[PDB]
Design a protein around this ligand. Sequence first.
Ligand SMILES: Cc1cc2nc3c(=O)[nH]c(=O)nc-3n(C[C@H](O)[C@H](O)[C@H](O)COP(=O)(O)OP(=O)(O)OC[C@H]3O[C@@H](n4cnc5c(N)ncnc54)[C@H](O)[C@@H]3O)c2cc1C
Length: 508
Amino acid sequence: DSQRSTLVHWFRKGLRLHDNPALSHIFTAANAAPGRYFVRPIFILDPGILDWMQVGANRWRFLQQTLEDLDNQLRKLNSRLFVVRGKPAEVFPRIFKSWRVEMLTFETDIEPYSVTRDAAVQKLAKAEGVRVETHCSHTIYNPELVIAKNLGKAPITYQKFLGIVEQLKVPKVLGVPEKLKNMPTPPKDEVEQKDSAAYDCPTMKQLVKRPEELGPNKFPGGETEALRRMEESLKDEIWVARFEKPNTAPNSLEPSTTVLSPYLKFGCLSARLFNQKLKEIIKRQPKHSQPPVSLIGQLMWREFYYTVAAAEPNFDRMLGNVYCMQIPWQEHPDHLEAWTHGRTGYPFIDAIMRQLRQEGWIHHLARHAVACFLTRGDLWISWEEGQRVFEQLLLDQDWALNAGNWMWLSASAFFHQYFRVYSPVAFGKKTDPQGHYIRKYVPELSKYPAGCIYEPWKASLVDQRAYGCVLGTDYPHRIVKHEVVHKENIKRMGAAYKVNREVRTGKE
DNA sequence: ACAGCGGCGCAGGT
DNA sequence: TACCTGCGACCGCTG
Ligand SMILES: Cc1cc2nc3c(=O)[nH]c(=O)nc-3n(C[C@H](O)[C@H](O)[C@H](O)COP(=O)(O)OP(=O)(O)OC[C@H]3O[C@@H](n4cnc5c(N)ncnc54)[C@H](O)[C@@H]3O)c2cc1C
């Protein structure tokens, strides 16, 4: 085995065995040549970032669980995961030389960090005489090809995007990789000799530095659970078929929606397997919804955002963003901290922000409620700030998706009907009139009648006391007054829209 | 050139 | 039930 070469698959995104052309390529190459190769499936933990703040304790746990599952699955194919600690730049040079790597394969990522990183690793491999074959399986449709077919522009409207995509071929969704035939463990590398457990899966302690920030384990990580959740979600085909996003409740105690997003984000679930499964159901169901409200529609929204983000490195900022509106957002530190910790004084908003911090997922409509309140609805705080918070607390934190959807809610891009402002009091009531959701996440107000649980300021002091929650002590006073402010922000929106319009006129 | 069209709010009705 | 319409006047795309 001294004369063997190594074939390597690099997991960054796409943490699954199913529908992984990059991964499969290896496994099939290996057994095609039974005794000529050593297979290393690797994940590169950049350990320094653990102390980093744009990672929630909850998301760390999700990754930890994901890697363990991925290892277990790999184990069943006579292999294993290798979690290599270090920076790609300082690891790869060592591994190609020490393992004698012949091929490196990975799933392509459009994010700017990933672009610059991959380019660097492409360059390094090119010098070192290492073959690199990359595959595009994070999204159904390659954003590069979508732009191409729209004459080199990324479509900035959903209907237009659908028209472009439908005329593109949908790639074949693969199964799991084959069981490696005749594959002894690769000999320990310099680092493995010194410590055998070096490329083992990280323990919870190793990844979760601040475990007190962990909330209830509602959504376990990994491909196994992803597939399991999906199958259960697809069980009721009628539900699936007649699914319309706006008609789903943000405040229901159990999720109205699938909650497959985190799995789709980490690549524990293949968006192509999902698309494929959905299509099969629509076909068996005459009465069914269509885009953009339908469940396939929602998947196509993910693709939309991925395309537009691919064309713009400044996708996650107002400044230098081609799609984005230039709006004079204002600094309001105290207002920002209050919103971050769900102490706005608005129970519905506070409920949502708390669920987010505690569980790491909140319903899409709920995200709307909070985002609007923060950006154009009331506070007048920049969407970049909200994006920052969400990045920290979301399990399904996605650079393209989070950016794109925050612009939408701030009416900076992709949305423009700024007269439509969500009422932090009115919006919640329609689907949870009793205020059950508020009672759960803001238990301080759990004894309040439905008549003013959304609007505690409407209750007299004698009333508050009697409810066991006196405002200004046991609960925060509302930081702003929605009726006065939102109308005022509406005017500011129109002002900033006009200004952007001149700038456009002037370039011409 | 530019207007008509299609694109997850609220309140107050039937 | 699941519509209707003022609100004040948005955008991108189309012909
Ligand atoms: C301000 C804001 C930030 C968001 N940030 C993220 C994010 O960071 N990562 C993320 O995956 N989604 C994000 N979303 C989109 C959406 O809220 C979630 O994907 C959805 O709530 C997840 O619940 P689900 O997976 O059950 O959705 P379902 O309704 O079950 O939809 C299933 C799939 O649709 C895809 N999808 C649904 N809505 C959207 C959307 N608006 N844009 C793109 N894809 C969508 C989701 O990936 C999900 O995997 C954000 C939305 C908003 C308003």
